[PDB]
Design a protein around this ligand. Structure first.
Ligand SMILES: OC[C@H]1O[C@H](O[C@H]2[C@H](O)[C@@H](O)[C@@H](O)O[C@@H]2CO)[C@H](O)[C@@H](O)[C@@H]1O
Ligand SMILES: OC[C@H]1O[C@H](O[C@H]2[C@H](O)[C@@H](O)[C@@H](O)O[C@@H]2CO)[C@H](O)[C@@H](O)[C@@H]1O
Ligand code: NA
Ligand code: NA
Ligand code: NA
Ligand code: NA
Ligand code: NA
Ligand code: NA
Ligand code: NA
Lengths: 452, 454
């Protein structure tokens, strides 16, 4: 369905409750006369920035919040302006997840974290540690079963283990993420991925295992454990499996640290239906009845709507989800997240398959994930090199009142100035400040060029 | 102007034994008629690269080896080619310090490491730790003395403490330094500099203390300790102080880690007197008699000449020098060293004065020391960006076949390619190789424009 004024087209991932969302859409149409079409395209999170400005994109896009900063930086998302009463209906930390450079860029829907899911009839007492899993697998293999199967093709699922002993994405410090400081090839990351690779070398897991292979094995009663999120509980409910949901195993005595996602709904900046989309999202979806319809299809996790979460929170599966969430980290929403995930996806797949050592794979991922800093630095310095000597002086002065000590800047050339801007404010803010200051020193040419 | 033919002009720092060196020069003149002039200009390590780039300067320059890789890269130093029997006379690790890009670029003279020097009458037992020094100062202050004074204006002297708990210049791995990995603002570096600044805040040291102030205070018996190298011992000999030379204090249980220098003699690439210089250095200076003449003026430290060092090593001051040298690290000689030193110099001065916090000062130093990599990267990426798709492919093909894995290069964009090249070759060679290849793939315009870059 193409976008047209007077209707809504919604994209949501295929593992979520899209049939439930379509029920909310049908209720909306009943009550307003306005048609809603829910779709679940493959790779929608890659497709959206390719087609967002066209009629072949959606009016509303659902994804975890980590992708949204990149979308907003590219001008793809409308600013969200909820009134006071509506904002108070949702938990503050969920609004935080969708805040980007001081603006709300989506509606938060639900908090997602991975848990350990286990078959109580194969495994009444699940392991508290990763280290126990080889022994468990050995005994289960004797019965033609296995201990653990989960998706090894997406780094989301392996990240909790990589992070446990000290791996991280971007270091948080000074009120921001430092995109130069990447933690994917430190000792902790290496330790975690080496444990994963050792499980595969010792035939306790298969490098080819993906989402569908793991889901089928668990729901058929072939493997004792899997790792997945709340959306997966619906198919297990349907299965004959008596299952539990519990804290992830520790590694080297430390909790597994899943990256926590907030399912979020953004409004296409190019949509002729922005007000229509706001009405649907605020007054039909983010209601008790709306979220229940989606949740009944596939569980959302811990929803952002206080009134409905007070019910869901009593569910032990939700308590476990929140326990794992608290041990993990909220994902950044910065634009560099896409490149981080691609880099780590390649590292895990290459290490797991044996095509690269863990050391080589993570070293390459480190370099790939950090290239965004180098690119930002070189671009900013190249613009600053255009300034005349007197214009650079004025540039440094105005950086005080825009909001770095003058003594730190006085001697600095264009490259050092780019370094200072990015290290102090981060890449996006450094760029915004630079271009803004350009039009303050009569270099609107640079401002114009920088816009393009 | 060209350097004058038929004599030798030598530059050496004023804190070294230049009068003793002039005595060796006179011995040379007695045998050969060749006049040797020894000078000690201020800031000679900064003046030499300016003067030598234009083909002027001294015939021979003495400095620690860390400055020499930069000089060599700029074409300022002649390759040294001593015969095997001569090379055999000096310790292998001193030759290592003066090797750059596979070639020897200077003669090593002596190993220099900082030690703790103490007044045995004020302080019969020197402190094991840095941590105990504030209490020591409090006690001495009640006797009209102080515990410790040393030069706070040059980072050489403060580096041993900054490095003790984990600070480092450039990361060393696989016989190669990584210039994008700078260790001047990690936890260890911050802890060390914070201790120094707290010494000053609590009035156990003065941020304004420099070399001459510290030397006077120690040599007049006003402070119980100083930190200095072997060149300082002669002046202390002439004072009334009964002194010892010992291991530096530890910090958080870790030894202080001085950056170790090898005093080295380089031959100016522009000199018409290279044979004279070789003859002087090999057959007059680097002999027992030659080094003794210099050493008796101002001590050299642990000399590179095996035969003379076997005598000096019996001196407990030399044993202590070598103990501190072992706990420290030989300085890199890569061109980026001078930028590192300038960066840390500013950081220590600003933190000590209270102009910046330790965290702000070391953050700036980190940025400044890291800029050499970034500058090379941004320039090389800009030039590779100018290549058409088919030219970039050709650029890669020549680099992959020439008499770096293809898998690393094949799908790399200009910025990634610039990264690969600088990492694999170093910034200087990466750039020269790039320009050379531009010429090879019908982009002589980039070669031409590139040659005119700074
Ligand atoms: O694997 C990288 C991937 O991780 C996250 O995607 C999750 C998503 O958040 C979940 O709701 C569910 O759909 O599983 C996905 C993993 O397959 C990030 O949100 C995503 O951007 C990233 O590519
Ligand atoms: O302070 C930085 C400075 O340290 C070293 O200089 C030493 C030199 O090696 C010693 O022989 C003696 O003269 O003291 C100097 C410090 O004042 C490095 O060799 C030099 O490059 C660097 O700038
Ligand atoms: Na069931
Ligand atoms: Na990605
Ligand atoms: Na004396
Ligand atoms: Na004496
Ligand atoms: Na003397
Ligand atoms: Na050592
Ligand atoms: Na310097």
């Amino acid at each position: 369905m193409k976008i047209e004024e007077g209707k809504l087209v919604i994209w949501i991932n295929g593992d979520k409750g899209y049939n439930g969302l379509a029920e909310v859409g049908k209720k909306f149409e009943k009550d307003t006369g306005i048609k809603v079409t829910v779709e679940h395209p493959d790779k929608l999170e890659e497709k959206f920035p390719q087609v967002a400005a066209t009629g072949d994109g959606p009016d509303i896009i659902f994804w975890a919040h980590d992708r949204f900063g990149g979308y907003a930086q590219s001008g793809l998302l409308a600013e969200i302006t909820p009134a006071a009463a509506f904002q108070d209906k949702l938990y503050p930390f969920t609004w935080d997840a969708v805040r980007y450079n001081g603006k709300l860029i989506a509606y938060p829907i639900a908090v997602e974290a991975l848990s350990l899911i286990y078959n109580k009839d194969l495994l009444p007492n699940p392991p508290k540690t990763w280290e126990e899993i080889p022994a468990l697998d050995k005994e289960l293999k004797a019965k033609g079963k296995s201990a653990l199967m989960f998706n090894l093709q997406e780094p989301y699922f392996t990240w909790p283990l990589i992070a446990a002993d000290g791996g991280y994405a971007f270091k948080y410090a000074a009120g921001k993420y430092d995109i130069k400081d990447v933690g994917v090839d430190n000792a902790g990351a290496k330790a975690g991925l080496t444990f994963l690779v050792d499980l595969i070398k010792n035939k306790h897991m298969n490098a080819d295992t993906d989402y569908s292979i793991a889901e089928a094995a668990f729901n058929k009663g072939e493997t004792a454990m899997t790792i997945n999120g709340p959306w997966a509980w619906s198919n297990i409910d349907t299965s004959a499996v008596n299952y539990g949901v519990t804290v992830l195993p520790t590694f080297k005595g430390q909790p597994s640290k899943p990256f926590v996602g907030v399912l979020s709904a953004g409004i296409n900046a190019a949509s002729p239906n922005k007000e229509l989309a706001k009405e649907f999202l605020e007054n039909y979806l983010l209601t008790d009845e709306g979220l229940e319809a989606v949740n009944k299809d596939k569980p959302l996790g811990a929803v952002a709507l206080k009134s409905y979460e007070e019910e869901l929170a009593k569910d032990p599966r939700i308590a476990a989800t929140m326990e794992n969430a608290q041990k993990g980290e909220i994902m950044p929403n910065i634009p560099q997240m896409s490149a981080f995930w691609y880099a780590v996806r390649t590292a895990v797949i290459n290490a797991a398959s044996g095509r690269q050592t863990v050391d080589a794979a993570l070293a390459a991922a480190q370099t790939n994930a950090a290239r965004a800093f180098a690119a930002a630095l070189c671009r900013l310095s190249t613009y600053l090199e255009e300034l005349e000597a007197v214009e650079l002086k004025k540039f440094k002065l105005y950086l005080g009142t825009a909001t770095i000590p003058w003594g730190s800047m006085e001697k600095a050339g264009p490259l050092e100035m780019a370094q200072l801007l990015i290290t102090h404010f981060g890449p996006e803010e450094a760029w915004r400040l630079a271009l803004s200051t350009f039009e303050r020193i009569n270099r609107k040419d640079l401002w114009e060029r920088g816009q393009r």
